[PDB]
Each structure stands twice: as structure tokens, then as C-alpha cells.
């Protein structure tokens, strides 16, 4: 009996961490509509439904959302697929041309600056001999002045030929479910109070991740996953300031963003089978786009995040907010997309407060670019086409991204400023539950039995 | 309504259980280990990584005594300096995750001993069927 013999055991539950490519799959209702309505109707598989989320007991797997993988490769995959949805579309190489711009028909005041210009220019036709004088409406941010007369050109002409988005494809989020291949598994922290670092007492394996809708947003991440009961702030090292502070609050704040202009698009032929979608006339009042949140719910959620930020910074601490210190337009304020058009909507109205240790609404104004330079490449831009009619959408603000200032010299107040920066902090706010492991069978163990001859 | 034993019999359902109780279900972990325009290459190399790793594991079984037994008695004694634990404490105390860290340091000695044992068994069986 004391002569213990070894025996191998194949198919043993034991794992280590690993880094592998995962596999996307979206819901079958997105597959009910067909043929490149949005991206990855062909690049992903339809899911096997009701994925096996089975509980796993007596287990303590340490997680880490900050050195996590699958947020790195998702940030690679969405950029690469964003590029893969632009190859069939129209290049705006023939449109880099001298523009003869003028002010739009509107009551004009010298102090005020119009956000739109009325630009006429020569453009080629179906016939290479003939050309046409045609006009469009542009924003101030898309044109620059080249230098009496007043003639303009587009901003991106000196650095990159631009690509119109195809109006057939849409930009709306469809939820991805990331699935592990054969020989791996996805663990999920089912714990409630979990800052994303260290032990999670209740983990559970799962076939595929839950619905991850991809939102593009710099500050104030939208349509996200709410917390269970508390408001949880999350950081890699809170005493450091260069690392962002991902806030996730429980009750969502409804935001209503709109564009009160009534645009008319205008198909301009460039060549054979080439259509450039410009802006025709404005029908109605020339107004400025904006977003609305409720004052009461926003002050309530700021009270919640002050109550939760005082857990790390003392109870006798003044906490105040500010607007952004500076940078490019799509990091000083929160950018998003609403029905296919990009907003850069100022947030100095929200983040102005200070807090002591004891049916209204906010109208905050937006801007609209038509070209974009997402993820800041070297020779890539996207001319987003205009869309018909008055546009509005409704979204639930779910979380925040904050940044502390490096306050030396006996700083009692600890001011917090928003900042987007990397897109991955949007993505890390949804993969905080998930990690990937590699199944390693062929366990070996001693027991009391001996193989005969 | 699902029952605790039903999710016990799922994939990785016994990772916190004792290894004596986890030994009753090994076919589940062994089964969800094989099956489950540019992206086809990525999924294709994932599938061939899965089948190639499964073939490496089945070959490491096959060079030992057992090809498809899934529980393999063999004939090298457990050197008690490897773990110095009692029998009934390891089959009723620890999981498999807790055991692997205890034997991660003493491994690739065990695999070479198994290959030596199988080579010795094959030459002894060759001699036995030779004199018959």
C-alpha cells in the first residue's frame, strides 16, 4: 500500500492563463437582416443561443482588467474592420479642389460666426471633356482658407485623400459576443464588489461573452452595462494620476441629443458610378445642435460619485470638477455618433461643481464635423455623408472617464477633469468581468493500483 | 430548478471539487477540447491549433501505456520526495488546481520516467513473445 504508483488522468479540470485570438459572433436578429447593412454580418457566425453560463464553486482566480488581453485584440479588430468597411466606398480624390465659398443666407452679425459656408466649385462629370459648377454646404471645421476674394479648400487635402462612407452601410452598434475556441475557456467574475484586481471569489465559466455593443465615445461612455447596486470607481493605481479612473454608476442618466436642422442631401455625380452626397438647402430655421440631460438626476449621480470617491480620499476632502484642460476637439469634449452623424458636444456645463464634506434640464451645445480622423492615422479620413431630416436619438449615460490633477503643495481640494484619450478605456469598461484561460488536460497523480503484465 | 448536480456535470464543473470527486467526470473536459474574408484564416488557424494540441496530447498518451483508456495504471513508483503527502488527504482535501502548483516543479521527470517504463515494457514483452 505504501508503494504508491503514479497514474495519469486525461481530461482534468486545471488551467493557466493564455493569450489567443477569440472569435466574434452576433445575435441572430442582426442576421435576420442581410447583405452588409452593418459590419460583420458575414465576418462573424450566428450564435448558438442561450450560452452555457454554469457556476463554478470554491474557486479563487485573480483577475486583472489592466493587463488583460482581449481588449487589446478587440481594439485591433474594430480598427481593422473599420478599415475593411471602407474599401468598396468612394474615394474623394477628385474633390480636393479650389472652393469659392461664401456665407450662407442667414441674418448676419459681425460678432457671431456662422457654422456653415456655401461653397461653389467646379466638378467633373460622367464625361471627361465636360464639367459642372455645383455648390454644397460645409461646416467651418471642414474648410480652411488658402491665401479681396475669399476662396477655400478642405483641410485634409494637404495630407490624405479622403473616403466617403457608403450611405448603404450604417454605424449603429450591434452586440458582439466574443467566444472562446476549442481548448480554451472564458471566466467571468460574478462578484458584486470588485475593483478588477485581485481575487474574485465567485467565478463562472461561460461559452461566449454577453452583449457588448460597440460605442464610440471619448468622455461619458454611452449605452453601457450598469452596475448591480453601488457606484463603482475603478483604476489601476489610484494614487497615480496618469491612469484614468473608470466610473460606473447604477441608475443611468438619460441624455437627449438632437440636430434641429432639416438637411436636404444632393447627389453629385463625380464619374461613372460615383456619387458624392453633398448638403443642399436648409429648409427651416438655422439652429445649433445640442444635448439635454436632466438637472436632478445628474446632480444625484454626481452626489453618488462624490460619495464613492470619498472612500479612497478621506471623508474630510473637498472634491470639485472642471472642464478639460485642452487638446484636440475630440478629446476636450465628448464625441459620439447619433444616427450616422458625429457630435462634439461641449461638457463645461456638466462638470462644474464643488462638494463639501457634510423639471429643469441642461442644454449643452454641440458641433458637427463631416470628415473624421478616428484613431489618428497618418493617411486615413472618412467623409461622413449628411442625412435627411431632423435627427435625434436617446441614450443612457452609463459611466465616466475621469482624471485627477497632480496636486502638490498641500492640496486640500482634488479636482477631477474628464478625458477620453485612448478608446480602450471604453472597451475595458465592458471586459472587466472576463478573462481567458487555457484548458490543460493530462493531470498526473499518485494512487494505489499497479498495471499488470 | 436546474439542480446543483446538473451544473456539476458541465464543462469545468468540478474545478473546486475534490480530485477524488472530480475523477468521476473527466470525459466532459475531454470532449469540449476538440470540437467546441480574412477572418477565415484566423478561425482556421485556431481550429488547427486545437486539433494539433489534441494530437500532441494523444501522442503523449500513446507513447505511454494507454492509448484511449482515459485512466491509466502504470508501473513507475511514486517517489515520495515529490509531494510527501498522505493518500486520503490528497484525494479528499485538494482540487486539481491546487495540486498542479504542488507538482509543477516536479514534472518532465515524471514524463521521462513514463517513457522509460514503456520502452522497458515493450522490450520485455518483445522478449517474452520471442521465447514463446
Amino acid at each position: 500500500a505504501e508503494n504508491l504508483w503514479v497514474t495519469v488522468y486525461y481530461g482534468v479540470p486545471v488551467w493557466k492563463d493564455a493569450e489567443t485570438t477569440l472569435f466574434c459572433a452576433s445575435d441572430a436578429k442582426a442576421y435576420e437582416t442581410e447583405k452588409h447593412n452593418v459590419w460583420a454580418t458575414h465576418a462573424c457566425v450566428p450564435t448558438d443561443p442561450n450560452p452555457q453560463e454554469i457556476h463554478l464553486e470554491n474557486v479563487t482566480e485573480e483577475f486583472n482588467m489592466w493587463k488583460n488581453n482581449m481588449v487589446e485584440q478587440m481594439h485591433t479588430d474594430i480598427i481593422s474592420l473599420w478599415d475593411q468597411s471602407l474599401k468598396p466606398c468612394v474615394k474623394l480624390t477628385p474633390l480636393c479642389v479650389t472652393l469659392q465659398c461664401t456665407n450662407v443666407t442667414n441674418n448676419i452679425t459681425d460678432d457671431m460666426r456662422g457654422e456653415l459656408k456655401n461653397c461653389s466649385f467646379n466638378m467633373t462629370t460622367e464625361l471627361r471633356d465636360k464639367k459642372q459648377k455645383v455648390y454644397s454646404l460645409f461646416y467651418r471645421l471642414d474648410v480652411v482658407q488658402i491665401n479681396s476674394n475669399k476662396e477655400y479648400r478642405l483641410i485634409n487635402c494637404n495630407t490624405s485623400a479622403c473616403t466617403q462612407a457608403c450611405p448603404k452601410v450604417s454605424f449603429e452598434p450591434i452586440p458582439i459576443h466574443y467566444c472562446a475556441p476549442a481548448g480554451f475557456a472564458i471566466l467571468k467574475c460574478k462578484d458584486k464588489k470588485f475593483n478588477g484586481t485581485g481575487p474574485c471569489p465567485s467565478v463562472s465559466t461561460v461559452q461566449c461573452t454577453h452583449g457588448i455593443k460597440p460605442v464610440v465615445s471619448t468622455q461619458l461612455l454611452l449605452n453601457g452595462s450598469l452596475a448591480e447596486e453601488e457606484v463603482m470607481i475603478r483604476s489601476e493605481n489610484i494614487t497615480n494620476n496618469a491612469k484614468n479612473i473608470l466610473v460606473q454608476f447604477n441608475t443611468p442618466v438619460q441624455i437627449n441629443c438632437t440636430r434641429p436642422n432639416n438637411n436636404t442631401r444632393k447627389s453629385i455625380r463625380i464619374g461613372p458610378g460615383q456619387a458624392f452626397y453633398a448638403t443642399g438647402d436648409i429648409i427651416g430655421d438655422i439652429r445649433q445642435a445640442h444635448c439635454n440631460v436632466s438637472k436632478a438626476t445628474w446632480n444625484e449621480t454626481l452626489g453618488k460619485v462624490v460619495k464613492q470617491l470619498r472612500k479612497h480620499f478621506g471623508n474630510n476632502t473637498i472634491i470639485r470638477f472642471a472642464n478639460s484642460s485642452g487638446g484636440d476637439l475630440e478629446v476636450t469634449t465628448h464625441s459620439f455618433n447619433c444616427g450616422g452623424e458625429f457630435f462634439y458636444c461641449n461638457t463645461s456645463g456638466l462638470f462644474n461643481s464643488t462638494w463639501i464634506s457634510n423639471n429643469d434640464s441642461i442644454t449643452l451645445p454641440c458641433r458637427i464635423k463631416q470628415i473624421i480622423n478616428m484613431w489618428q492615422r497618418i493617411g486615413q479620413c472618412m467623409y461622413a455623408p449628411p442625412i435627411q431630416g431632423v435627427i435625434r436619438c436617446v441614450s443612457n449615460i452609463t459611466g465616466l472617464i475621469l482624471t485627477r490633477d497632480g496636486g502638490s503643495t498641500n492640496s486640500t481640494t482634488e479636482t477631477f477633469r474628464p478625458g477620453g484619450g485612448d478608446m480602450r478605456d471604453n472597451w475595458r469598461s465592458e471586459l472587466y468581468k472576463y478573462k481567458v484561460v487555457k484548458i490543460e488536460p493530462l493531470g498526473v497523480a499518485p494512487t494505489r493500483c499497479k498495471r499488470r503484465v | 430548478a436546474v439542480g446543483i448536480g446538473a451544473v456539476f456535470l458541465g464543462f469545468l464543473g468540478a474545478a473546486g471539487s475534490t480530485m477524488g470527486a472530480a475523477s468521476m467526470t473527466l470525459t466532459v473536459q475531454a470532449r469540449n477540447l476538440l470540437s467546441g474574408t480574412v477572418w477565415g484564416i484566423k478561425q482556421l488557424q485556431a481550429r488547427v491549433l486545437a486539433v494539433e494540441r489534441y494530437l500532441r496530447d494523444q501522442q503523449l498518451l500513446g507513447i505511454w501505456g494507454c492509448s484511449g483508456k482515459l485512466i491509466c495504471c502504470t508501473n513507475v513508483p511514486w517517489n515520495s520526495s515529490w509531494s510527501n503527502r498522505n493518500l486520503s488527504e490528497i484525494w479528499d482535501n485538494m482540487t486539481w488546481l491546487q495540486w498542479d502548483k504542488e507538482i509543477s516543479n516536479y514534472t518532465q521527470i515524471i514524463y521521462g520516467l513514463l517513457e522509460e517504463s514503456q520502452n522497458q515494457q515493450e522490450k520485455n514483452e518483445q522478449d517474452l513473445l520471442a521465447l514463446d
Partner: antibody
Amino acid sequence: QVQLLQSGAELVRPGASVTLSCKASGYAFSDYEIHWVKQTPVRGLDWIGAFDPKSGASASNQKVKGRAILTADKSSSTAYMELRSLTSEDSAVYYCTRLRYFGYFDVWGTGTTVTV
Amino acid sequence: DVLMTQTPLSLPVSLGGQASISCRSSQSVVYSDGDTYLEWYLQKPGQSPKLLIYKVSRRFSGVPDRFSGSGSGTDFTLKISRVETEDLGVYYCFQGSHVPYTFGGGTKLEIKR
């Protein structure tokens, strides 16, 4: 016949240990599970956990985790408890129950009013 | 935690009147078999809790032709035609979907007066 014979009332001082017994009868005992439900009049219905008689599986949720160890004698068909250092909030009406694999709660115990 | 919410809490309903109890989950109740596991219950003072419905609308044998469950996904609702003295007491929602299991918050049915 279709019963879950529990113990009586249990007047147990705090700081001690508490056991239970579900001396069920009527059917096969391997094929049916044993779960455990609390009744407080404050919250309503709460959980402890589960013991699987076939596989030997058992679990307990996080509030009762660190205290409860679920064992059973399959021959005498008696479930058990090991509660450790309860409070007055743990004073509640406990219930041995049964489940099937992919079934539902057929039988219901009488309720042990453990008051501490 | 797939913590359940019951709305409303109290329901004074005259005997013979109608009553309906709503429940909401924080996740989907769907298990891998496709059958979401919801169990509507009973409780009377001085007695053990008992079954009413062990699935979406598949009631337990011993229930008359008045009780029915309904709903989808995360939002579910009970339906009773006529309220009896036997139909009084506290009712409950429950998930048998996946570990950990959760109950509701209890709904007391009383009589209008």
C-alpha cells in the same frame, strides 16, 4: 409518505454550533436533491445552499459561505448542517426541500424555527 | 446575483376580484435548454411555502383554472381571475435559472374594505 421530516424548534445560544436533520421518507433519495431555504419576516425567502446525494456535490451562497457544510447519510436519508457562530439575523425558519435534475420543488419540509 | 424585484408589494383585492403581480430580473432567465426556470409560489402564516407554477406558464398539478404565468425575457406577470380565501397570503417569484438562486420580496394579498 411524501414528507421531509425535520427536527423540532432549536433554542440555541449564540456563539455555538447548529446542526439539522432532514429524515425524509417516501421515495428514492439519490434521485432527488436537497436544498435549504430561509424565512425571515423582514426579507422573506432566502438561501443557504445545496447537497447532491448522487455526485456528492454541495454548495452554499456567499452570505452563508464560510459557515455551512452540507453532508448527508445516504443510507439513513438524513441531511445535515454545520452552522458556526450565528447571529439573531440567522434566527429564521429553515426548510429542507427537494429538486430533480431539471425538475422542480416537489416536496416541502415543515420548517425548523431556529431562534437564537 | 440575479436579484429579483416584485411590483407591487401590497394588493387589497376584494374576493372575486382580479389580481396581477409583476416581477423583473437583472439578467435573462434563459438557461441552455431554452426553458427559463421561473417558479411562482405560496406562503401562508403557520405553514410551509408551496408551489403554484414551476415554469413560465406550466403550473403545478393541483392548481385550478385561474392561475397563469406570462411574460418574456426579464419581465413577467401573474394572472388570477378570481381571488379566494385560499388564494390569499404571500406570493413569490423565483429563479431556478442559474446559481445563485434568488427569490423576490413577497406580495401580500388582502381584501378591499
